[PDB]
Amino acid sequence: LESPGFMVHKKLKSMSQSYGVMMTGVPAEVLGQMQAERSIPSINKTGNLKQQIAKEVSKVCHMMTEPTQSCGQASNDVCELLLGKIEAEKFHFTKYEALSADGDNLKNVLENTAPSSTNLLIRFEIDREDPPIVLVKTKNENFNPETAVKNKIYLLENKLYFIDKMGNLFNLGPGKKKCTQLFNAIGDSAEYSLCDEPEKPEDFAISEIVDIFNEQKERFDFWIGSHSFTIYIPQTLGESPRQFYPYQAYFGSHTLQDWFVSDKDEYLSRIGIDKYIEKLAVLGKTTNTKERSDIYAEFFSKRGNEKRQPLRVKFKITEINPELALKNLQETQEFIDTHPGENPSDKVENYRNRAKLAMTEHLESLLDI
């Protein structure tokens, strides 16, 4: 006996592990035609075309299994499947909540649910901050604040400016006495790094500028979207303990398929839901880079890029109708089962061969064959 809310995770994991990119719903013909489009700039049409068409078609071959799926597409597919178009739209516009340092809010809100009659889908965004890397020493006679490169710190003799990536000029505070002390303390190189125990008065002048900046990090916003993932806590049967399951892809590392094939979903679930929120909170609180990299690798990396600058965790939560979600997955497998094939691997091979025929034909219609 298994709850319907749990069958949702079963079908979802089973379909992704077996069929991969086919779970997006994209017809193989559409996908091959497109691949031909993003590969036709690289084709010099003064050379041999059947050379390049076959080469390009063959390069996309050894890539299908390569991690070219983004965390957002996986997270979006999951929300769409478990919620349907209407509720995924409203879920997409719901505002993210910032995680508490110990995760008290997410912990507490889960406790307000009956683990046997409620099915939660949690979606997280992880944000990195991107402070400037470079300190540029320049003179007033060479510095127009509109010309200068962005996302840099600029040390003048009478000012110390920070130019963010958007264009807004910021005065970092040091008086005109302080700036000349730093200007005459730093050498002749055009650029310098804001990241690297000081020994030379050059190093002290750079480290204090880092300090003068970091005490006013408040005034800026460097944060960029870094990683996306979801978590599903289905219903339990009676006296059964609650279980969560993380879902994610990671561009460059693994797909949503690879994540399932490696059973990392099941590996992280066994550590329990609350202990997960805890290690998730430390990632947003810690300032130690080894600890921030320890957790980040354990949670969000392949089963089988040092996170130096801080990370923050935000979430939004909703409830699943397992009947709807199974119906949504049924319609998706209906599409999948329109591809000839004795078994899932046979159906994937038909998708790939079908897509390759569309990529080759679309290349030929564009290059006069």
Binding site: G25, P27, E29, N76, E80, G84, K165, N328, E331, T332
Partner: protein, 104 residues
């Protein structure tokens, strides 16, 4: 459910392909920002306009997709309208350029 989900993911793959092609094409703009200025015009184009200027810098795919999207990608289902394609071309062009010039 499935048709709406498929149309979404088909539209997403197109946007991704638009972003990759336009970006590769933007990487070779001169110091007069010709290709970028062209990209800005595109994000403000009238959706009823059925003609590009004769020696348009825009990538071949973009203009083919704009004019006859169902000839440009003859596997694309009819439930994707020419207007929907064109709205997507402008929203992608607006997002790329603002990212390219670092406002997002």
């Amino acid at each position: 459910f499935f048709k709406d989900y498929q149309k979404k993911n088909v539209m997403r793959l197109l946007q991704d392909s638009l972003e990759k092609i336009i970006n590769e094409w933007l990487k070779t703009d001169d110091e007069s920002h010709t290709k970028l200025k062209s990209l800005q015009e595109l994000s403000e184009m009238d959706i009823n306009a059925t003609s590009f200027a004769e020696h348009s810098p825009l990538p071949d795919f973009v203009t083919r997709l704009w004019l006859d999207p169902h000839k440009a990608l003859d596997a694309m289902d009819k439930n994707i309208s020419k207007n929907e394609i064109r709205k997507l071309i402008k929203e992608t062009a607006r997002e790329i350029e603002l990212v390219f010039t670092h406002q997002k």
